[PDB]
Design a protein around this ligand. Structure first.
Ligand code: MG
Ligand code: MG
Ligand code: MG
Ligand code: MG
Ligand code: MG
Ligand code: MG
Ligand code: MG
Ligand code: MG
Ligand code: MG
Ligand code: MG
Ligand code: MG
Ligand code: MG
Ligand code: MG
Ligand code: MG
Ligand code: MG
Ligand code: MG
Ligand code: MG
Ligand code: MG
Ligand code: MG
Ligand code: MG
Ligand code: MG
Ligand code: MG
Ligand code: MG
Ligand code: MG
Ligand code: MG
Ligand code: MG
Ligand code: MG
Ligand code: MG
Lengths: 85, 43, 97, 72, 60
RNA sequence: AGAUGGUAACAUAUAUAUAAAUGAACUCCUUUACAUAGGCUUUACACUCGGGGUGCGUUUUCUUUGCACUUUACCUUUAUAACAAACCUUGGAAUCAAUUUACUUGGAGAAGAGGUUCGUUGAACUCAAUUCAAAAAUUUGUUUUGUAGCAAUAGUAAUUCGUAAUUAUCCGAAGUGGUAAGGACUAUCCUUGAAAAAAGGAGGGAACGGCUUUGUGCUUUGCUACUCUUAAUACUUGUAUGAGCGUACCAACAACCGCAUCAGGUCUCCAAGGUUAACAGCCUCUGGUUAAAUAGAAAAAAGUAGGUAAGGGAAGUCGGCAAAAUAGAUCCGUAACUUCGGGAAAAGGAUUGGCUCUGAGGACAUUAAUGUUAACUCAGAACUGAAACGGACAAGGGGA
RNA sequence: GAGAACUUUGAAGACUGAAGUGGAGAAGGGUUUCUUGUCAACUGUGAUUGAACAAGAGUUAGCCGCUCCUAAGGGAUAGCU
RNA sequence: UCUGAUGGAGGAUCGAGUUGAUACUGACGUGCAAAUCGUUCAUUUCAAUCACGUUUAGGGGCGAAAGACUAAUCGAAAAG
């Protein structure tokens, strides 16, 4: 049985903290706890170690990236610009 | 306690020596006694 | 497999009657929790000064000693006597000092 | 403390001059077992024999300046 | 004053003071034992005994 | 002038003792060196069980009985074994597979097959020896030892004998999972969890035999035991092995701090049996006390710490303050409202003992049937009692 | 022992109940440890007891610590105030 | 998108101990005590607790703030 309807990862917090706050947390927690695609080995294994640091289990390559997501949009844009140049 | 510096040990020994009473023979020719429990050496 | 009781010292003071002892042993000795057996599994015979117990079944020397003690208690010989091991197969009555 | 199994090695050890004492022990086994201990400056080397006569022979063989300790 | 003797017996035998039985007959003999050697002698004799341990039966 | 093995992971010096496998400057790593949570596993310790051996205890009756003891240290890179990992070779995987309690992993090479290593562990395994017999240039079979050495000479419990000595014992199975440690993991963090001394490894390739003779440490000429390496021994050089300091005792119950031999305070480790979820509470063994700035007799008021009370049930009082009731577990049932997570142990019900049975749940190893065998937990049914049973202890009052 | 409810021994009955008045240590204390004596005071009752009084004794390390390393930190050197 | 397991998150729940100190405005109040005792109570994986070391010193410190605390001394310590 799927346990929580709306809550998901924020069930740990329970009743406390605003619902709004928990909603925000939810996006960010999803971003955090996703295994991302590693751009070197291919495997979706890049999980987050520290804040801006993302370790692939497979190849052990620590990518610096976002706090929550592996790639922020601004950074991506910057990269793209550089590539174009 | 059971781990003293040498100096401290020596001081303790000195104090102990001081403690002992007037040799009785002298009395034929003391107020600074200290009991270990009531008055401290305050080292 | 023989287990022995060197009954001499109190037998030669009359205080121990070996025939009675044998009977007692016969009565007592349980086999799979029943007294009356002692069939092909256990034998008890007696010299003048010695009881011989010969056993095919898993049986402990401890048990013999216990039986002896019980017997002693029954006939009031407890503060005078003592069962003590001589050889591995051999228990012996000894005077309390 | 070390054990020895090559009789030859034991003999060699015995021959070597820092080996001051031998300890020869008799043990009732569950026959008479014999433990031969040599007391070297460094280690106490011991050999176990099941067979008494052999043990006796090896004892006999041992240099007669050894300081033989018969324990029991 | 058998304190001392009791203490010595405790160590010698490996028992607690709560466990040493000093015979009330021949309290004179025992008091004379100011040593561990003497206590051992006493023990050998039977003027001092390690009491029997209080029983804790698993039976029940 | 500086060994070899192994396809490789890597291994190899077993000399009394694995001592020796060239290495300078200069570098680069590693160890030192690390959080918390969660379970899983492995070992030891503890506990327990059954059997053998010893002694003591019970014995009106009953009891193959109840209790005690049945021990084993560092050290020997301890040797090996087994196991979680990590890696190597081979192999070539979709009908995806292996696999954990959990998810983890795989064409960047999985499973399978055979290896290597570290780590646990510290005698497991035939481990080592020996017994003799058969096959190669040493491996297989059988037996007897060894508590592997330390180690029985020591401990323990016995038994005697003497006025310290002898003997006999010390060993065959297993369970529980309390404590500790290690392991492999997994998870959380806007928290990512010391440093250095010291040690090691690697990279690099500086420097390079000895003796005798000639010329100004260097060059030339001639001969072959040499360079290491531990250990011992000898001899000169200041006397060529281990400096100093602490170590009694208390640690609160009278040794500490509270003016005191003060119901106070004061850090850490060990940690048994029963009941139990429990290191709770209640009772017990080891160990410890039987003491506390008093004892005795009487037993009124009053006090204080408790009990109990017909009928009523907050009428008491500022106010249900105090007390009582409630409580453990299992099964049922669980509203308003809600941030949909909760509320919730909501509320509110039932059951619970003892005995005698029944059923369900493993491991192994013979060859689907037949064996040896282990916990403890669940569920159900009889009977049973002065209708009682979380019988003491312990343990929410609830609602609007 | 002059003298004993509280000194000692034995026999009972009990309690502490491995989160212990149990074993070990730290801080603190400083000889309170130990034996032999012993009772003027003290040990708020007694006391022959004692952590009291007196006489003596007692603490043994290459391996247990300190000693060495660095930590938060401290005191300094150069200057500069 | 439901159902059953698994899994073991949380300044989650209860709770010994620990850390406190709610009530009895209980005992005590010439005390055991210049703040103790009893029963009850709150706290127990985190803004947790404890130790030792260390930093901060008086019109200064330190304060999740009570003018709290700063050696029984605090709306300005103590000593002289
Ligand atoms: Mg000190
Ligand atoms: Mg004081
Ligand atoms: Mg022995
Ligand atoms: Mg000591
Ligand atoms: Mg006190
Ligand atoms: Mg003072
Ligand atoms: Mg004590
Ligand atoms: Mg007192
Ligand atoms: Mg009423
Ligand atoms: Mg009513
Ligand atoms: Mg009224
Ligand atoms: Mg009213
Ligand atoms: Mg109330
Ligand atoms: Mg008194
Ligand atoms: Mg009790
Ligand atoms: Mg009690
Ligand atoms: Mg004393
Ligand atoms: Mg008095
Ligand atoms: Mg005295
Ligand atoms: Mg004195
Ligand atoms: Mg050391
Ligand atoms: Mg230095
Ligand atoms: Mg610093
Ligand atoms: Mg300065
Ligand atoms: Mg208050
Ligand atoms: Mg009050
Ligand atoms: Mg009053
Ligand atoms: Mg103050």
């Amino acid at each position: 049985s799927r346990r929580t309807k709306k809550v998901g990862l924020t069930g740990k917090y329970g009743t406390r903290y605003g619902s709004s706050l928990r909603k925000q947390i939810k996006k960010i927690e999803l971003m955090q706890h996703a295994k991302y695609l590693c751009t070197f080995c291919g495997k979706t294994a890049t999980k987050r170690t520290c804040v801006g640091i993302w370790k692939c289990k497979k190849c052990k390559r620590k990518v610096c990236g976002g706090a929550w997501s592996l790639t922020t949009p601004a950074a991506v844009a910057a990269k793209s610009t550089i590539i174009r140049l | 306690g059971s781990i003293k510096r040498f100096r401290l040990k020596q001081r303790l020994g000195k104090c102990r020596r001081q403690n002992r009473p007037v040799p009785h023979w002298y009395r034929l020719k003391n107020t600074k006694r200290r009991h270990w429990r009531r008055t401290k050496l305050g080292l | 497999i023989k287990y022995v009781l060197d009954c001499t010292k109190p037998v030669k003071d009359t205080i121990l009657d070996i025939s009675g002892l044998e009977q007692f042993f016969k009565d007592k000795i349980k086999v799979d929790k029943k007294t009356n057996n002692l069939k092909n599994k256990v034998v008890v015979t007696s010299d003048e000064y010695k009881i011989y117990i010969t056993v095919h079944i898993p049986f402990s020397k401890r048990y013999i000693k216990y039986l002896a003690k019980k017997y002693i208690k029954m006939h009031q010989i407890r503060d005078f006597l003592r069962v003590i091991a001589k050889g591995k197969l051999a228990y012996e009555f000894k005077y309390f000092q | 403390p070390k054990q020895i199994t090559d009789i030859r090695k034991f003999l060699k050890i015995s021959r070597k001059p820092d080996t001051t004492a031998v300890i020869i022990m008799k043990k009732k086994s569950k026959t008479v077992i014999t433990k031969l201990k040599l007391r070297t400056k460094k280690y106490l080397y011991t050999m176990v024999f099941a067979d008494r006569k052999k043990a006796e022979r090896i004892e006999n063989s041992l240099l007669p300046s050894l300081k033989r300790i018969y324990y029991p | 004053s058998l304190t001392l003797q009791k203490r010595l017996a405790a160590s010698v035998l490996k028992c607690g003071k709560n466990k040493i039985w000093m015979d009330p007959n021949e309290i004179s003999e025992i008091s004379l034992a100011n040593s561990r050697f003497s206590i051992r002698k006493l023990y050998k004799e039977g003027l001092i005994l390690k009491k029997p341990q209080k029983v804790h039966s698993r039976a029940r």
